[PDB]
Design a protein around this ligand. Structure first.
Ligand SMILES: COC(=O)CN(C)S(=O)(=O)c1ccccc1
Lengths: 300, 237
């Protein structure tokens, strides 16, 4: 179990750690988060009390270094940093734990939610979507645009998700126009899986990362990417059986975790109704269709 | 974007454009089978592709053999239309290719867009106008060449005959739409109006009779009357 210490908390802020969150008062004696499960990526995220504009946060993996948070009064945000001095860091954490100034990652033993949301998500792939190669952790916020959003404006601060566009030469083989547009299997299996992602694990990893940035930061381009990646599978007549079964599990836990009051902005009526009731895979997403119908029957 | 009453004069500017109407591509007769079920029999169809500025009708005849062994024909027909329009554009010299293609039915947008991905600078547009191009099969010479075709075939017609020698393309299009609207509302009456007078003939190389300017005004008046008439007969007004 690992630790992300905080130098201090000088501004009132709601702090998220994965699907958990807690309120820290201005100059409250808070010095970080302990007992963070090793083996998963994590996200630590922030919403200032005085300006809910810009949710922002950091994706990190404690196996990759010692990370801490420090407020910057010039740029006005909590910044993640790496501490290269191992002995210094260990000494800092031990002191903060002894004085019990850290919240405990509050994982219930039965609970596999975070694993199930991050099963295929790897830090190395996050870092290719979020390019800032001098850090081992990745900053994301509510306003960051995607490469695709920028083609339709600062490239350094973009989310480089894989561009999916169903009316594009990449998606449509010359002479197979009707076939490829009505059955996206070529685009899913040859172009994207064999060609770009290499395997379904990397595809699911990007899909899960896009969902999490949508949910935790209200990042609109991430929500677009999440839905595009679902729609590309559901609109393919030919999908490996193991991918469909895994997709059903992935989406089940995403829908389960989604705040009820955010469904209106985080869920695209057209995509979900098409995927569950019209698409080739309308009958292949049993768990996802059952939770959607019992939790968001209005959308459908 | 969408073509409507506000931007109607854009049809007659000097940017090459084509209307594409797919209504008559997939045509069937519905009949009873010996067993008392219902079946369809396809008959020949046509894509109606029209330059409104010049009167250039590229009439691609769709022979029933194109449907043999195919499923979901009403859907295929839109993609076949789009394939044939795309093939037509690629066949034209660059300086003759359209800058815009306006589809008369919104269901043609995605099939045509996908077939024209190679032409990103050609705008594919819908329209809010209710254009009467389905009635093209009420023009005798066009119906004749469609029904006689034994194979796929493209036939060329000026749908304005020689009218542009005497009138603008705005006025020619308005005349055309009035004639076709009439033929669509009451084909028998419309055709009676057009041919009742045996001294006015259709030239061998024309579609419509050789009316003088004065006779076109009479004719056009009679077509309006017919459209208003049928509008009462229909609604009891
Ligand atoms: C494709 O074009 C047409 O339908 C109309 N024309 C090129 S035309 O000049 O009127 C003409 C040319 C050849 C035959 C009949 C008419």
């Amino acid at each position: 179990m690992n630790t992300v210490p905080f130098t201090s908390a000088p501004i009132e802020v709601t702090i998220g750690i994965d699907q958990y969150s807690f309120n820290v008062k201005e100059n409250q004696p808070f010095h970080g988060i302990k007992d963070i499960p090793i083996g998963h990526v994590h996200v630590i995220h922030f919403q200032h009390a005085d300006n809910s504009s810009m949710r922002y946060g950091y994706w990190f993996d404690c196996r990759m270094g010692n990370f801490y948070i420090q407020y910057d009064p010039k740029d006005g945000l909590y910044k993640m940093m790496e501490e290269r001095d191992g002995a210094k860091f260990e000494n800092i954490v031990h002191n903060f734990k002894e004085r019990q100034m850290m919240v405990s990652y509050p994982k219930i033993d039965e609970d596999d939610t975070w694993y199930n949301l991050t099963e295929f998500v790897q830090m190395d792939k996050i870092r290719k979507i979020v390019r800032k190669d001098e850090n081992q952790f990745s900053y994301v916020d509510s306003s960051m645009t995607t490469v695709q959003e920028n083609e339709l404006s600062d490239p350094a601060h973009s989310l480089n998700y894989t561009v999916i566009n169903f009316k594009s030469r990449e998606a449509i083989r010359p002479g197979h126009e009707m076939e490829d547009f009505l059955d996206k299997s070529y685009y899913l299996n040859t172009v994207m899986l064999q060609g770009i992602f290499k395997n379904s694990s990397n595809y699911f990893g990007e899909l899960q990362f896009a969902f999490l940035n949508a949910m935790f930061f209200g990042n609109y381009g991430s929500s677009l990417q999440w839905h595009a990646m679902i729609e590309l599978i559901c609109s393919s007549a030919t999908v490996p059986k193991h991918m469909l079964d895994k997709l059903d599990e992935i989406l089940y836990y995403q829908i389960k975790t989604l705040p009820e009051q955010y469904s209106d902005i985080l869920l695209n009526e057209r995509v979900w109704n098409i995927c569950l009731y019209s698409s080739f895979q309308k009958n292949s997403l049993h768990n996802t269709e059952k939770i959607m119908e019992n939790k968001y029957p209005e959308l459908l | 974007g969408a073509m409507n009453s506000s931007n109607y004069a854009e049809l007659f500017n000097n940017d090459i454009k084509l209307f594409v109407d797919d209504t008559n591509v997939y045509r069937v007769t519905v009949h009873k089978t010996f067993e008392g079920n219902v079946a369809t029999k396809a008959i020949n169809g046509c894509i109606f592709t029209l330059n409104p500025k010049t009167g250039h009708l590229f009439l691609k005849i769709i022979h029933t053999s194109v449907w043999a062994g195919q499923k979901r024909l009403s859907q295929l027909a839109k993609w076949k239309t789009a394939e044939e329009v795309s093939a037509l554009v690629r066949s034209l010299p660059k300086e003759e290719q359209p800058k815009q293609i306006i589809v008369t039915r919104k269901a043609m947008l995605d099939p045509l867009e996908v077939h024209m991905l190679d032409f990103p600078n050609i705008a594919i547009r819908p329209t809010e106008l209710r254009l009467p191009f389905s009635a093209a099969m009420s023009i005798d010479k066009l119906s004749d060449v469609v029904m006689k075709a034994t194979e796929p075939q493209m036939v060329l017609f000026n749908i304005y005959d020689d009218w542009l020698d005497r009138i603008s393309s705005y006025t020619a299009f308005s005349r055309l739409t009035l004639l076709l609207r009439a033929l669509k509302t009451n084909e028998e009456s419309a055709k009676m109006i057009l041919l009742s007078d045996p001294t006015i003939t259709i030239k061998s190389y024309h579609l419509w009779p050789s009316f003088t300017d004065e006779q076109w005004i009479t004719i056009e008046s009679q077509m309006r009357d017919l459209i208003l008439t049928e509008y009462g007969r229909k609604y009891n007004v």
